[PDB]
Write a protein that binds this ligand. Structure first.
Ligand code: SF4
Ligand SMILES: [Zn+2]
Lengths: 66, 107, 143, 431
């Protein structure tokens, strides 16, 4: 923790995985894996050792009335 | 405070009588259900047409068609008029699922 | 036999002053459709050979192929009593001729010939494939 | 085809009554498979934005255009991203169009104007385009490859450009005895004349087996299916619609007695507005839901009818392209839609759709044998060829309320013949 919260914030702004501020984080991870762009096997391995926490399993701007 | 402790009583679409069970129509107002389905699908149809004209206008005012919109401009009518149609559509879509589905989906 | 439907048509047409299509005369007398067309042709031939000056008007149906500009279309028309042979000579191939209706006093357009068939359908709604030449098998009331 | 066989016998009906009259049987429909499952939407969550659709469109359409620009301009390839371009160097770019037209209405008849620009756009930035390219034939939303160089004013000079093209197509088995399929569109129940009423009556009377001699009754018994394609209730003004569903229920009852029927929603029909239109609810048809020969589908309809695979719409993509382009011929617009590998490229920018996010479903994944359209103002049909062994029959279905014309498609020779109905009107040739 506090190092796992920057890896996800770095996965969320890389443009080669998609334009993602409307959906979940694991849905975008599996969308890129289907098309197989290059999802890395570390943004998966922190979404498995946690429960349904809203500060891991949510996009950066999931507040913010946009 | 008290607003969270809802019961969410269902109501007849025809004559507004609260009753037990989830069916949309009332037992006295049943022979008239095709007309009550006809009514309100022309409302869902007009909310669908308003969602699409607004959420693609932000893409042309922003410049790009491939990246997210971030513009909370308080002097634009576009902002917060694009926020309420999501909820109107959220509500009007769920009122028509009182009626069954028009077919299967797992075939 | 013959006098039965001959007198029935002679009271339907000339006394009650009605308009008799083949489908009305097959829902009245409970007859097959082709046999009803044959009945109407029998009546018109008898009463047009007897007298030649009756108060009787006919309308027929002509169907068949055509070529307008290269392409082969299929034209189907409900025609009056004056214009039959010209419509028959415009066509290329002929495929169907029978009788459609008879009248007492002449109409102006094809208005009431839909009203009659519609109204006799309106009360007779559990049977339409009853006197039909095609009898499918998978269409029986199930759901 | 049909009217050739309809004269192949003897004529009995200008005769006095007989002992027997012949009857027949409807031909079996021993194979059918609906494969329109990507258009049936079970969950239907809104609250996304329209940027997930363009991104997956580009990501899926990119290898087709790379693989065609290789064999169309030589394997000495120069394909490059829009940011890595050097001034005045020959390269190939793969991107998405955006047409910048004024006179297109904003929130607060054709719409093409003599000045309007094209812009090639990728995920990161844009660039303007001039040179040898058509300014008014192309529409916003087409993905294409292009050849040229970055000039000094920041613009781009285009020499030639290529589209995605036709998809692969497996061959169909041949048939033994010819079966026919009838296509109708746009009855317009609610307004539109009285000659349309007798035309609709004569059409259902021919197909059900009530009209004509043993030739017509032998030939209409071979018609295996009936497809009704959109715009069933033409409406004069919304703000009438309740009394029209009763008559549509009666007509679908009189057709569900003999044939199998497939019914599709249209521009005015009681469904949603976005483009994968969902099937009609059965609670508006009391009478016709007794039989299991009536079926209700939606807009983008696929099927496999007796080996031959069909795909069609009710004519909402073709008229949308007709609004914001310069092409007039509807058969040409249908073939162009086939050429860019997308059923409706102008969506969403001027034709609304659902906000998908996983995969864009309007990209052709295979090639259909038949491909029809909806409510077009006149009949037309054609056969086109692919680069490989790919042949496609293209039909435009007319509109019944004006022309009173339907189409017969043979399933063994694969040809289409028009059928027209016309009762006599107020006609007197002595004036
Ligand atoms: S909310 Fe209004 S100002 Fe902001 S991008 Fe949309 S249209 Fe433009
Ligand atoms: Zn009630």
């Amino acid at each position: 923790e506090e190092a796992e919260l920057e890896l996800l914030r770095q996965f969320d702004l890389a443009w080669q995985y998609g334009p993602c501020t409307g959906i979940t984080r694991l849905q975008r991870w599996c969308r890129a894996k289907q098309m197989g762009l290059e999802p890395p096997p570390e943004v998966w391995q922190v979404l498995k050792t946690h429960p349904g926490d809203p500060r891991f399993q949510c996009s950066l701007w999931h507040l913010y009335p946009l | 405070g008290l607003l969270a402790f809802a019961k969410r009583r269902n109501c007849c679409i025809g004559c507004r009588t609260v009753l037990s069970h989830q069916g949309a129509v009332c037992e006295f107002c049943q022979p008239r259900e095709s007309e009550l389905y006809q009514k309100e699908v022309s409302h869902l149809n007009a909310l669908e047409e308003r969602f699409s004209r607004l959420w693609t206008q932000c893409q042309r005012c922003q410049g790009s068609l491939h990246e997210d919109v971030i513009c909370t401009s308080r002097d634009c009518p576009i902002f917060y008029m694009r926020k309420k149609v999501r909820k109107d559509l959220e509500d009007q879509e769920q009122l028509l699922r009182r009626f069954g589905p028009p077919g299967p989906e797992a075939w | 036999a013959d006098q039965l439907y001959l007198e029935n048509i002679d009271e339907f047409v000339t006394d009650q002053n009605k308009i008799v299509t083949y489908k009305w005369l097959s829902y009245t007398l409970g007859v097959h459709v082709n046999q009803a067309k044959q009945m109407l042709y029998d009546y018109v031939e008898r009463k047009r050979k007897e007298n030649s000056g009756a108060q009787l008007h006919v309308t027929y149906l002509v169907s068949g192929s055509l070529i307008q500009n290269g392409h082969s279309c299929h034209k189907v028309a409900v025609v009056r009593e004056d214009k039959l042979e010209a419509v028959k000579s415009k066509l290329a191939v002929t495929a169907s001729i029978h009788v459609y209706s008879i009248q007492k006093a002449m109409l102006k357009d094809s208005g009431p010939l839909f009203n009659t068939d519609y109204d006799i359908l309106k009360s007779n709604l559990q049977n339409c494939s009853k006197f039909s030449a095609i009898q499918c098998a998978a269409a029986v009331p199930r759901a | 085809m049909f009217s050739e066989q309809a004269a192949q016998r003897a004529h009995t009906l200008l005769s006095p009554p007989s002992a027997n009259n012949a009857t027949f049987a409807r031909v079996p429909v021993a194979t059918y498979t609906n494969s329109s499952q990507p258009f049936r939407l079970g969950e239907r969550s809104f609250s996304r934005q329209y940027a997930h659709i363009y991104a997956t469109r580009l990501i899926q359409m990119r290898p087709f255009l790379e693989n065609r620009a290789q064999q169309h301009w030589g394997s000495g390839v120069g394909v490059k991203k829009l940011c890595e371009l050097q001034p005045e160097e020959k390269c190939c770019v793969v991107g998405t169009l955006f047409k910048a037209m004024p006179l297109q209405p904003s929130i607060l008849s054709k719409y093409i104007h003599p000045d309007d620009e094209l812009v090639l756009e990728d995920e990161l930035q844009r660039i303007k385009l001039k040179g040898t390219i058509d300014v008014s034939k192309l529409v916003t939303g087409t993905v294409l490859a292009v050849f040229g160089s970055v000039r000094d004013d920041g613009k781009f000079l285009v020499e030639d450009y290529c589209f995605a093209d036709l998809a692969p197509q497996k061959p169909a088995p041949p048939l033994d005895t010819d079966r026919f399929v009838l296509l109708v569109s746009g009855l317009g129940l609610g307004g539109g004349g009285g000659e349309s009423l007798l035309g609709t009556q004569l059409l259902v009377d021919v197909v059900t087996g009530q009209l004509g001699d043993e030739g017509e009754q032998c030939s209409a018994a071979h018609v295996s299916r009936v497809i009704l394609a959109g715009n069933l209730l033409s409406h004069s003004t919304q703000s009438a619609s309740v009394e029209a569903v009763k008559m549509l229920d009666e007509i679908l009852l009189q057709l569900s007695a003999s044939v199998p029927v497939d019914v599709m929603p249209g521009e005015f029909d009681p469904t949603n507005y976005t483009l994968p239109q969902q099937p009609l609810h059965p609670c508006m048809f009391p009478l016709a839901t007794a039989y299991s020969t009536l079926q209700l589908v939606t807009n983008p309809y696929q099927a496999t009818i007796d080996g031959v695979r069909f795909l069609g719409t009710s004519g909402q993509n073709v008229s949308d392209i007709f609004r914001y382009s310069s092409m007039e011929d509807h058969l040409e617009i249908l073939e162009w839609t086939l050429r860019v590998r997308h059923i409706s490229p102008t969506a969403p920018d001027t034709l609304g759709c659902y906000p998908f996010y996983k995969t864009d479903p309007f990209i052709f994944p295979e090639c259909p044998h038949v491909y029809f359209c909806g409510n077009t103002p006149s009949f037309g049909s054609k056969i086109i060829r692919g680069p490989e062994d790919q042949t496609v029959l293209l039909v435009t279905v007319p509109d019944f309320s004006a022309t009173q014309t339907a189409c017969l498609v043979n399933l063994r020779s694969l040809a289409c013949q028009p059928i027209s109905f016309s009762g006599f009107g107020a006609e007197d040739d002595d004036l």
